[PDB]
Coordinates of C-alpha atoms and ligand atoms in Angstrom, one line a residue:
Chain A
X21 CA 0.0 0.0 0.0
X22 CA 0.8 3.6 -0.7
X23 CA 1.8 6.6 2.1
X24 CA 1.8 10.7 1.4
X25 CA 3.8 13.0 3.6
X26 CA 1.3 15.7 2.9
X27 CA 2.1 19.4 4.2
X28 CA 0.3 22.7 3.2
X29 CA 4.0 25.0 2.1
X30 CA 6.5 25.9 4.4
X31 CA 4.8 23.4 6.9
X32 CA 8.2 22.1 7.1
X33 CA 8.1 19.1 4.8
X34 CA 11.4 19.3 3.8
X35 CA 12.9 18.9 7.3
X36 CA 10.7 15.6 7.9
X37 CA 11.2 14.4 4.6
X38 CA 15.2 14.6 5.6
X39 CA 14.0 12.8 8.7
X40 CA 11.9 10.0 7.6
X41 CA 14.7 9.2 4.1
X42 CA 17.5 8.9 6.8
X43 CA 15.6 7.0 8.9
X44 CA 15.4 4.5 6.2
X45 CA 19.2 4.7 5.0
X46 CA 19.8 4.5 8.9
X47 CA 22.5 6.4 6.4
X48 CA 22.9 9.9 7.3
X49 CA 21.7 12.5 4.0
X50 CA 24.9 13.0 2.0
X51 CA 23.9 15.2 -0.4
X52 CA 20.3 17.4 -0.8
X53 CA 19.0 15.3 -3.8
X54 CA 19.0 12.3 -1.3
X55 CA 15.7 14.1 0.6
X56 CA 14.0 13.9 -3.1
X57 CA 15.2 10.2 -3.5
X58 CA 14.4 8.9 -0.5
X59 CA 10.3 10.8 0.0
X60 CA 9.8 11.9 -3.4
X61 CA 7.8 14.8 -4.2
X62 CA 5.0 14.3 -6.3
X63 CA 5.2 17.5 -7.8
X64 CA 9.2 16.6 -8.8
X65 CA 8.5 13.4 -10.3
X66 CA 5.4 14.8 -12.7
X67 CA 7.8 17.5 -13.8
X68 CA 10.2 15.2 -15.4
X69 CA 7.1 12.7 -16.3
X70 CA 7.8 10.2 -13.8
X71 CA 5.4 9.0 -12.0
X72 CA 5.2 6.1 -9.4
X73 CA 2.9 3.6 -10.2
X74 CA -0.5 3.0 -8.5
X75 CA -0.4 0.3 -5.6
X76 CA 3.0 -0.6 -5.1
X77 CA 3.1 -4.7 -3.6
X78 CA 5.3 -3.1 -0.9
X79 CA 5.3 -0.3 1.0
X80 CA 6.0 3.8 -0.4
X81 CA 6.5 7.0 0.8
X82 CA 5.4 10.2 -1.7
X83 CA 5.5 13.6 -0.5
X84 CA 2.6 16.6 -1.9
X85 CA 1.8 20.2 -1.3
X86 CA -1.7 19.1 -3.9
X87 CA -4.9 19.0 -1.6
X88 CA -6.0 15.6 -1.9
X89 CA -8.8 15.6 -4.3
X90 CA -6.7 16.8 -7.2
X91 CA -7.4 14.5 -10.0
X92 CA -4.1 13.7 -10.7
X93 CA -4.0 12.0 -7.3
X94 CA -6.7 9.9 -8.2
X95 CA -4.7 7.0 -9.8
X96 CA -3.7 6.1 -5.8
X97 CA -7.9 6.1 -5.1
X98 CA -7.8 2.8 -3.4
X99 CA -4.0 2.5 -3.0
X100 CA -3.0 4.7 -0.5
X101 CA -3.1 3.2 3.0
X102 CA -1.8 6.0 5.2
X103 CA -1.3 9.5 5.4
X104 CA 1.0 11.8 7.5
X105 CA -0.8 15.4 7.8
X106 CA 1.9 18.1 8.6
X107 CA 0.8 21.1 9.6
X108 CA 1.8 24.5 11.0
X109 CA 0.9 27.9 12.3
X110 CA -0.6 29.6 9.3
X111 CA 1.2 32.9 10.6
X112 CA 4.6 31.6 10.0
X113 CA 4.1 30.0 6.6
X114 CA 2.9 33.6 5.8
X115 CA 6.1 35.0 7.4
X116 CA 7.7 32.4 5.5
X117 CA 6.7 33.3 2.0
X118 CA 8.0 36.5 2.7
X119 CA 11.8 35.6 3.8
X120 CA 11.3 33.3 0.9
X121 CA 10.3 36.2 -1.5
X122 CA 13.6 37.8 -0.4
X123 CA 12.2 41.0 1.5
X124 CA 13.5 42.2 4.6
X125 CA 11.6 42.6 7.9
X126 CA 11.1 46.2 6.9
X127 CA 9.9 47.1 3.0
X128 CA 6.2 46.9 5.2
X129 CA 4.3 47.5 1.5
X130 CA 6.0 44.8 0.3
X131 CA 5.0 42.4 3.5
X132 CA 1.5 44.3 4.0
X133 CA 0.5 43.2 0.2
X134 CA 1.6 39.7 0.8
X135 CA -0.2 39.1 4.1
X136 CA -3.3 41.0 3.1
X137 CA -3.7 38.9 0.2
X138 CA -2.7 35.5 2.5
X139 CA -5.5 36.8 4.3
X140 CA -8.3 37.1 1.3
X141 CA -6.6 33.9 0.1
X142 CA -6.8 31.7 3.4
X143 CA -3.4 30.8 2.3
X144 CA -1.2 30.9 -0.7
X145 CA -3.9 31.0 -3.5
X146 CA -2.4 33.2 -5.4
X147 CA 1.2 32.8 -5.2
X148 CA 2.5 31.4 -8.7
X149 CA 5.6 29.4 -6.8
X150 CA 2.6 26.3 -6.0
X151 CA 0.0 24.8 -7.5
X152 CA -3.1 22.9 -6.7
X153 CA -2.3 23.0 -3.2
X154 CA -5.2 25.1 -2.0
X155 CA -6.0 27.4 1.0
X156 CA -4.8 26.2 4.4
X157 CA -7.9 25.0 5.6
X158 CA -8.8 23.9 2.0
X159 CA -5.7 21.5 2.3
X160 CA -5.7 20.1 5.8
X161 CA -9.5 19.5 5.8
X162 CA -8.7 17.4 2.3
X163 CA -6.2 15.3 3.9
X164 CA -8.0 15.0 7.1
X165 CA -11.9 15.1 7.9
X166 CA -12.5 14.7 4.2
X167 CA -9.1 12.0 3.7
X168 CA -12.0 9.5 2.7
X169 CA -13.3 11.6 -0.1
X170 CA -10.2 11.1 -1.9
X171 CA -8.7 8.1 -0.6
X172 CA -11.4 5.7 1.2
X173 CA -8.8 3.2 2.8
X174 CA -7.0 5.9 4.7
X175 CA -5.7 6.3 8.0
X176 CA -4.4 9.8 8.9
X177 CA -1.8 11.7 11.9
X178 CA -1.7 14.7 11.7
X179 CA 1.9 16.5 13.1
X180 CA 2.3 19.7 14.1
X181 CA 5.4 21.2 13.1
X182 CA 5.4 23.2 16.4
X183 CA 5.6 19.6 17.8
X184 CA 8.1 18.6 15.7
X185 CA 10.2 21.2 17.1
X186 CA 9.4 21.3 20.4
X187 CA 10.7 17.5 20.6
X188 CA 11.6 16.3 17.4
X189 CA 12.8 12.6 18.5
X190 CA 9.5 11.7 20.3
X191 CA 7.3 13.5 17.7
X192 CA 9.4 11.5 14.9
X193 CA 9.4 8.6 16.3
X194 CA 5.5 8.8 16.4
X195 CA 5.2 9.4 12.7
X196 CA 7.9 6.0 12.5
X197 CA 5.3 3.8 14.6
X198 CA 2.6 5.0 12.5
X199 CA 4.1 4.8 9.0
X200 CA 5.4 0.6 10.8
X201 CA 9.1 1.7 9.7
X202 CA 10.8 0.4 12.3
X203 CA 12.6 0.5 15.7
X204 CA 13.1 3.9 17.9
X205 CA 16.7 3.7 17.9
X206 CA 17.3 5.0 14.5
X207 CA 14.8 8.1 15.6
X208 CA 17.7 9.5 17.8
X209 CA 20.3 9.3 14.7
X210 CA 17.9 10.5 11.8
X211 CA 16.6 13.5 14.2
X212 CA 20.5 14.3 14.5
X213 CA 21.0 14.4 10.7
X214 CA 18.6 16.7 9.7
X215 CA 19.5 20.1 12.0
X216 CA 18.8 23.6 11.3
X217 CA 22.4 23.5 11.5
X218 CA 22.7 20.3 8.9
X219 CA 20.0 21.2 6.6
X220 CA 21.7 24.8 5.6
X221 CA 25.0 22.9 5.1
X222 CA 23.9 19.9 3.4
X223 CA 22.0 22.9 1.3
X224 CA 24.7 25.2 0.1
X225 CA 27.2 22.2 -0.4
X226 CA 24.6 21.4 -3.2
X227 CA 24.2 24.5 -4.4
X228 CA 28.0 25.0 -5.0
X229 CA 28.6 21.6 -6.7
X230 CA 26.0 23.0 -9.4
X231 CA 22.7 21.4 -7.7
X232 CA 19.3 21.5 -8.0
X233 CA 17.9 23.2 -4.5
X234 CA 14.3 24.7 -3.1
X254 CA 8.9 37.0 14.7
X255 CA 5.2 37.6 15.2
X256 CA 2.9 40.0 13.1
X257 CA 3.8 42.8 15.2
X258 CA 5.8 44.8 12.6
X259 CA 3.7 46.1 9.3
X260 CA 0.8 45.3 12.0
X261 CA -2.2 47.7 14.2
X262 CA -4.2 46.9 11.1
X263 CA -2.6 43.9 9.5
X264 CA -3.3 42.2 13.0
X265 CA -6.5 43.1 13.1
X266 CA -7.6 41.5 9.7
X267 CA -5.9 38.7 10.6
X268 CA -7.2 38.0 14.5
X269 CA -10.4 38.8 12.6
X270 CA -10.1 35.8 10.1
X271 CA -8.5 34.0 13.0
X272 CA -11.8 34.1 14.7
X273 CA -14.7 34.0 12.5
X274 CA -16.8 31.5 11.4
X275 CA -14.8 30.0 8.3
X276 CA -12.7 27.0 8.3
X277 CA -9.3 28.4 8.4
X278 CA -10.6 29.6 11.9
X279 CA -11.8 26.3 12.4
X280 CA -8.9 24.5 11.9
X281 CA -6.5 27.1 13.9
X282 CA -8.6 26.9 16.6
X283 CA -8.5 22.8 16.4
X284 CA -4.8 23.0 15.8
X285 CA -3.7 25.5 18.8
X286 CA -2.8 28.0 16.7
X287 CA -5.7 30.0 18.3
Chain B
X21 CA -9.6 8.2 -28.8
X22 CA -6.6 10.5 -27.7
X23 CA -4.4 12.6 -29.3
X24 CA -1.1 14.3 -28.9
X25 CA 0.5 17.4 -30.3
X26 CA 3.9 16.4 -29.7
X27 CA 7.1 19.0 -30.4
X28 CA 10.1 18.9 -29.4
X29 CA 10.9 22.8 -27.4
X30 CA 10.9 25.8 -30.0
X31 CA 9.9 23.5 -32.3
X32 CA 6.6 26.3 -32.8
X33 CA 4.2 24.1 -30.2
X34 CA 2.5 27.6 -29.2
X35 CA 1.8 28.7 -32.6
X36 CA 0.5 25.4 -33.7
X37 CA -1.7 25.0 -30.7
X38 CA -3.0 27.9 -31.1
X39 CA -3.9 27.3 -34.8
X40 CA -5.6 23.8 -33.7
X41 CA -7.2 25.5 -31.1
X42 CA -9.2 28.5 -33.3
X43 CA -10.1 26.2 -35.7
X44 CA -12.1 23.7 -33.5
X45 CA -13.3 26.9 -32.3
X46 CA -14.0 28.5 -35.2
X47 CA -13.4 31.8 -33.2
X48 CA -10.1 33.6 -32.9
X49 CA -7.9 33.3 -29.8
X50 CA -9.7 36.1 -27.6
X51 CA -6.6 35.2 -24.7
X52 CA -3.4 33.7 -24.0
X53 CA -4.4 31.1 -21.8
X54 CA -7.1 30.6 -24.1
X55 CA -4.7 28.0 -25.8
X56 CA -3.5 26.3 -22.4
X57 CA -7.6 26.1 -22.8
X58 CA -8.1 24.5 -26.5
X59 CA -5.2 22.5 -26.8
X60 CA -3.7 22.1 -23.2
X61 CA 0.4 21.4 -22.6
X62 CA 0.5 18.2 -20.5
X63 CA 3.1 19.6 -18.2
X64 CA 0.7 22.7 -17.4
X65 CA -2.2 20.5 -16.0
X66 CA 0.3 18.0 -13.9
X67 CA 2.1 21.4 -12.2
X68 CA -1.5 22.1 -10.5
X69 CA -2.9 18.3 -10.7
X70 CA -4.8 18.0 -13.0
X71 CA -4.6 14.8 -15.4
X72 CA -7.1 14.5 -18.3
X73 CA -9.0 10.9 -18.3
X74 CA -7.4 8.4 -19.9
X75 CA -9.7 7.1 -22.7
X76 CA -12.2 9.2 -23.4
X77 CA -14.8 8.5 -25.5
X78 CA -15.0 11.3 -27.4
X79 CA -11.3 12.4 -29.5
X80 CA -9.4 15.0 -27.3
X81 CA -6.3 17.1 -28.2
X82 CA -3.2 17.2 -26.2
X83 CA 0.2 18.4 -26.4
X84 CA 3.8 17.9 -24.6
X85 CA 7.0 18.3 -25.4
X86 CA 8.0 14.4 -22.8
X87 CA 9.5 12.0 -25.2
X88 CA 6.5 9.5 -26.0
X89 CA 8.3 6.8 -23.2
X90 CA 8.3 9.0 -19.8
X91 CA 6.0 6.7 -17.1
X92 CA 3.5 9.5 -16.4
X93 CA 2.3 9.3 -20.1
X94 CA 1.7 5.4 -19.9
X95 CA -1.7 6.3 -18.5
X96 CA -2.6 6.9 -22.0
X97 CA -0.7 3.5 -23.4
X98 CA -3.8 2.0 -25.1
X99 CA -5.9 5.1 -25.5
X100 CA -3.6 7.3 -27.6
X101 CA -4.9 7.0 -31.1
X102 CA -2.8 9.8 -32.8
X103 CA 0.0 11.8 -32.6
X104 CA 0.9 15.0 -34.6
X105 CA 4.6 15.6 -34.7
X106 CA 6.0 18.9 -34.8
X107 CA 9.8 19.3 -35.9
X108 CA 12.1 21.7 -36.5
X109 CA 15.4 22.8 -37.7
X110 CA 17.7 21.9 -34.2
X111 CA 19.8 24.7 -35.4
X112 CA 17.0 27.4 -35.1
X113 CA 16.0 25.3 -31.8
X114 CA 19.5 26.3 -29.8
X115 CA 19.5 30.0 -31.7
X116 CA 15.7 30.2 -29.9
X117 CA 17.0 28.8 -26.6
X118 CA 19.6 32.4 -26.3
X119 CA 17.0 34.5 -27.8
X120 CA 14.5 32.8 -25.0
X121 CA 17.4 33.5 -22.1
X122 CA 18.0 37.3 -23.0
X123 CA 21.3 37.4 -24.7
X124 CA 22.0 39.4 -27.8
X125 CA 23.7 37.8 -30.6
X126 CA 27.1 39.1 -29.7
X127 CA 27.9 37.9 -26.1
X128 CA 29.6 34.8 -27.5
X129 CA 31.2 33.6 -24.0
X130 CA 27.0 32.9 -23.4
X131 CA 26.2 31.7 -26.8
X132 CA 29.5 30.0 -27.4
X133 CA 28.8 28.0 -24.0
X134 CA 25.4 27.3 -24.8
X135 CA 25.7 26.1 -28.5
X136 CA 28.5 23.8 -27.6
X137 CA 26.2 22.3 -24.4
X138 CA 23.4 22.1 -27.0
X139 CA 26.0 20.2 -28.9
X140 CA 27.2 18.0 -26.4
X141 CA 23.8 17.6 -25.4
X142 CA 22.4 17.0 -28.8
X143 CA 19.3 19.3 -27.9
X144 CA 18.1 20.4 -24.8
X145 CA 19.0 18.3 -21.7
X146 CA 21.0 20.1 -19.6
X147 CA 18.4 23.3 -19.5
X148 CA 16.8 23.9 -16.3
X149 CA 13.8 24.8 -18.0
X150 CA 12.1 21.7 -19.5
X151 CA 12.1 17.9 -18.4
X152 CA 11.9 14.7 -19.7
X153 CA 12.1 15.9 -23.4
X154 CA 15.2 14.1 -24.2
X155 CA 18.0 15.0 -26.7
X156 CA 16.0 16.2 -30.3
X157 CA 16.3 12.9 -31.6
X158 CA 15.8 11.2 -28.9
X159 CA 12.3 13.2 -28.6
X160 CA 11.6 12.3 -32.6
X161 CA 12.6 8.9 -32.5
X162 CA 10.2 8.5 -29.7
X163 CA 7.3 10.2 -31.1
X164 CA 7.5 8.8 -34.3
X165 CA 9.6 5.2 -35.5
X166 CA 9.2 3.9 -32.0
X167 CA 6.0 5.4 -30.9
X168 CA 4.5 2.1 -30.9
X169 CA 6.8 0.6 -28.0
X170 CA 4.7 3.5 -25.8
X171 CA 2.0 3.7 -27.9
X172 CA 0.9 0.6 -29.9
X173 CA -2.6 1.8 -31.8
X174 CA -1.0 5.3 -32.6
X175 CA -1.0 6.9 -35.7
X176 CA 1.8 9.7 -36.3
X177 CA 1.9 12.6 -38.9
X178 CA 5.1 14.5 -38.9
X179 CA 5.1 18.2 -39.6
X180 CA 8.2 20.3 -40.3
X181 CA 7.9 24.0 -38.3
X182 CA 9.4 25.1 -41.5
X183 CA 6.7 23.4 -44.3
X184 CA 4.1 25.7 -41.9
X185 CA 5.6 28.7 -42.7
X186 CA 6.3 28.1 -46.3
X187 CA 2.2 27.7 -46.4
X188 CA 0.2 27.7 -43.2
X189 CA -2.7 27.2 -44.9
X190 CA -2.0 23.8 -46.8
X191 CA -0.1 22.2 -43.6
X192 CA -2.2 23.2 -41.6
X193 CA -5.3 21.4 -42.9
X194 CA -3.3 18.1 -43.1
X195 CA -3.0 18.7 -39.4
X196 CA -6.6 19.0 -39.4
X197 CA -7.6 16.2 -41.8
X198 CA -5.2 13.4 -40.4
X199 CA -7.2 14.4 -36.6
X200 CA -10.5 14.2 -38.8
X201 CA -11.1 17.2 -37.0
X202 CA -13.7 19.1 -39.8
X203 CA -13.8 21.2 -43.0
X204 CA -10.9 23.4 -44.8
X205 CA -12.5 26.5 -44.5
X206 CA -11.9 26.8 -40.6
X207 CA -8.7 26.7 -41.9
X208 CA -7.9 30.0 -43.4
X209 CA -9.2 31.9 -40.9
X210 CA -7.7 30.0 -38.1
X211 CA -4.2 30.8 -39.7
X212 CA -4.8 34.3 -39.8
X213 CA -6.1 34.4 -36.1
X214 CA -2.4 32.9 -35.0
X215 CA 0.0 35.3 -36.9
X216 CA 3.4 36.3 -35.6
X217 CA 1.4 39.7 -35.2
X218 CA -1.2 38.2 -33.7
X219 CA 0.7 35.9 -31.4
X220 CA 2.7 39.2 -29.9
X221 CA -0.5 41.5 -29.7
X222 CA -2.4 38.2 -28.4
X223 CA 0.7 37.7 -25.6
X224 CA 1.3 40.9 -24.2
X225 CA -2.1 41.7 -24.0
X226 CA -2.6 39.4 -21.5
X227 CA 0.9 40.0 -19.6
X228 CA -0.4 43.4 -19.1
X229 CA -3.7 42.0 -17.7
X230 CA -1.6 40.4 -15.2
X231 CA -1.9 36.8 -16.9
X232 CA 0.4 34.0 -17.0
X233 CA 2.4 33.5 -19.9
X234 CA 5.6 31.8 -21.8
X254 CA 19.7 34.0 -38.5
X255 CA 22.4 31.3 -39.0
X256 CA 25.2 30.7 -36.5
X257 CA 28.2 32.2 -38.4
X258 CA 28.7 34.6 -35.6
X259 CA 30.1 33.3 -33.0
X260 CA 31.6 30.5 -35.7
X261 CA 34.5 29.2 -37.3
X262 CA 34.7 26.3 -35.0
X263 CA 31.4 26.7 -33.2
X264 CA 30.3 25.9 -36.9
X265 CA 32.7 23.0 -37.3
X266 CA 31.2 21.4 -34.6
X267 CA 28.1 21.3 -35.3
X268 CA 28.1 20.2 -39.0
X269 CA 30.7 17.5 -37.5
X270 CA 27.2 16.3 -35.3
X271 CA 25.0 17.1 -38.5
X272 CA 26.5 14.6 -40.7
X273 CA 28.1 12.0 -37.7
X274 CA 26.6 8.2 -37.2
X275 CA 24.5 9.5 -34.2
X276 CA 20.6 9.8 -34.1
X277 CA 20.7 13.3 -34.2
X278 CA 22.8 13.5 -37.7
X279 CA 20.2 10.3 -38.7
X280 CA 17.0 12.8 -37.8
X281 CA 18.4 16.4 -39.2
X282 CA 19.2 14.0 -42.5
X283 CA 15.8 13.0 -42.7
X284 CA 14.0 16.1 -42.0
X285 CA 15.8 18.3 -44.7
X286 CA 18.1 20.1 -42.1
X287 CA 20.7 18.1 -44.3
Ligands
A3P1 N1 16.2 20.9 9.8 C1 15.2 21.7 10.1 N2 14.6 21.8 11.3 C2 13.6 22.6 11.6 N3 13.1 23.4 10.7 C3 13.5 23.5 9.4 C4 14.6 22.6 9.1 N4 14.8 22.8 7.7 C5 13.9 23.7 7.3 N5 13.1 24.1 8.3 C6 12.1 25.1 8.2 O1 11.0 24.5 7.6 C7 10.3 25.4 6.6 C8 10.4 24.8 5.3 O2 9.1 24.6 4.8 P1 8.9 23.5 3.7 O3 10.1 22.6 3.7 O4 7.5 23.0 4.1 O5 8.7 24.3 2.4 C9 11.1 26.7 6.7 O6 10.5 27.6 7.6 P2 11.1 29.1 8.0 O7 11.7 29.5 6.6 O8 9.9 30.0 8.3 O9 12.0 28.8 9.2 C10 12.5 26.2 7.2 O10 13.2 27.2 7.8
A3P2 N1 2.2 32.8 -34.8 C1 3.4 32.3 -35.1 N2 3.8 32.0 -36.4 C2 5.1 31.6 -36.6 N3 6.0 31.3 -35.7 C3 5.7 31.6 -34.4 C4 4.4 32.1 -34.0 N4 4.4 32.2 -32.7 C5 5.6 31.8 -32.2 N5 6.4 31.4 -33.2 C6 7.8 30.9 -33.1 O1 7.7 29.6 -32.6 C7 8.7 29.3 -31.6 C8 8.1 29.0 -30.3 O2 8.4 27.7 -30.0 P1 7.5 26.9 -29.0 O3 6.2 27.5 -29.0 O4 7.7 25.5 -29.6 O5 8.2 27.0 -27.6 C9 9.5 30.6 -31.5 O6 10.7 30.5 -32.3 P2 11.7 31.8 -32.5 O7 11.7 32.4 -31.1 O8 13.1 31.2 -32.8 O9 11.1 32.6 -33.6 C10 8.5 31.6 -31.9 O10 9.1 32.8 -32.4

């Protein structure tokens, strides 16, 4: 049966993705391609018009930003067994976008425009960079409450990257268990691999050998706050699922 | 039955999909994206997830620029009942590639490098921009002599970029009448819809309305020119095609 690492953008899907391919090698990640090789992205392989074929005998792990009800998806209907939902505070993907954009704490027009239209969005809508991925609450509730709209034999955890962070073995190790990958011992190693610290080296080592790669509101805020503690409490589903997801 | 407009990049895919895609209209091409609409690129609907049913039961266009082998298109293995090939001179191909980056005709150090890449390359596979298209011949070869080891009930007709521009009008309606798509009359009017004029008015129009959207080699020569012609007339595949295709 089939298994999807599914995370809304800048969730922090690349960082468990690192996690879960070294816990596999055992093998620490050598070299930034390896996170593609070892939890490929969906999005990746359709690029380059590969595509992994509906159920496997044996067990695989795909990555995907898509909500789950794209079509495209629909060749793993009855495949896919399980699903890992990662998920994080809508306010820092939106702070994320813009350190990703390039933009400085400061140029507040530029940051204003971006998070007002996050806002009207409910996520990253209309930011060319993704596709098919949805809003925020658009996504989780397609991989979640609604899994079985999409993929009927499903199981679900959902992982919060706050959670990840706050104790990344533990947390791990609970995504291990569910995915049945293993021990608990190779939790502590693959946690170690994949480090802020790691990550940014294993990243710029690639980038120089020629390789393919990639607060709070208070600032800009008074009024940018407002709209968003607004949408953060009303009755739509993005406020729904912060509210479910202690992001509230 | 289904049906791909195959093309190898800068072979003239846009133009020609926009031709095929008036005429089933019958009405000009009001918008840019109105093509992505009529005739849609493959890799456009997999980027946001979508992925056209495989055997439909009415006759649907398509079009990619994936060598006829890549796994995603094997959806479409018994399905695929035709297959218009779109070719041109792999010369003009690498000249469109450095108008395409920016680069003016003189900075040889950039065209130099790229031509001799190309070269190497035999077409386009170390660019960033596209994936799984192969090498030109590779592409051809793939599309046409062994289309039947990806596509055994397919039909091809093979159309040279340059044979369009000579006479839109005749090629054109053999494009038509090999996809049994209608009369000859459409076909007139549809060429005069899609006109280098057209296609720039037609494109920047839409840019500006915030939409989404995109010689001989003397110069640079002596040696750049020697190898190349060495290619052109080798034992390779690439030599085999350009041979074949009046490139000769
Ligand atoms: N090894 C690691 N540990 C913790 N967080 C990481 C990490 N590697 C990347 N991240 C963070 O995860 C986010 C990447 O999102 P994704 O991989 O889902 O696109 C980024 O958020 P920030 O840029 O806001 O810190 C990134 O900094
Ligand atoms: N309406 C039209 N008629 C003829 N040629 C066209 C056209 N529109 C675009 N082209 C040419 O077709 C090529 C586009 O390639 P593709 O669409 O396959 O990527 C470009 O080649 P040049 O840029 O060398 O002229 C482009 O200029």
């Amino acid at each position: 049966m089939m298994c999807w690492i599914a995370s809304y953008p800048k969730a922090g899907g690349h960082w468990l993705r690192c996690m879960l391919t070294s816990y596999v090698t055992g093998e620490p990640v050598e070299t930034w391609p390896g996170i593609q090789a070892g939890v490929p992205h969906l999005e990746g392989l359709l690029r380059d018009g590969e595509a992994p074929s509906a159920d496997p005998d044996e067990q695989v792990l795909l990555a995907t930003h898509f909500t789950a009800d794209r079509p495209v998806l629909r060749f793993y209907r009855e495949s896919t067994a399980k699903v890992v939902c990662l998920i994080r505070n809508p306010r820092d993907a939106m702070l994320s976008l813009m350190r990703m954009k390039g933009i400085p704490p400061e140029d507040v027009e530029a940051c204003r425009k971006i998070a007002e239209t996050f806002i009207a969005d409910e996520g990253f809508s209309s930011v060319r960079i993704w596709a098919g991925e949805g809003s925020w609450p658009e996504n989780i509730r397609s991989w979640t409450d609604s899994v079985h709209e999409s993929f009927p034999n499903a199981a679900v955890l959902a992982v919060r990257y706050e959670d990840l962070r706050k104790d990344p073995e533990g947390e791990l190790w609970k995504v291990v268990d569910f995915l049945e990958l293993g021990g608990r011992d190779g939790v502590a190693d693959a946690v170690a691999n994949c480090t802020l610290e790691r990550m940014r080296e294993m990243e710029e080592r690639s980038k120089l050998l020629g390789l393919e790669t990639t607060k709070s509101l208070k600032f800009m805020g008074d009024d940018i706050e407002k709209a968003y503690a607004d949408l953060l409490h009303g009755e739509t589903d993005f406020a729904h699922y912060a509210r479910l997801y202690g992001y509230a």
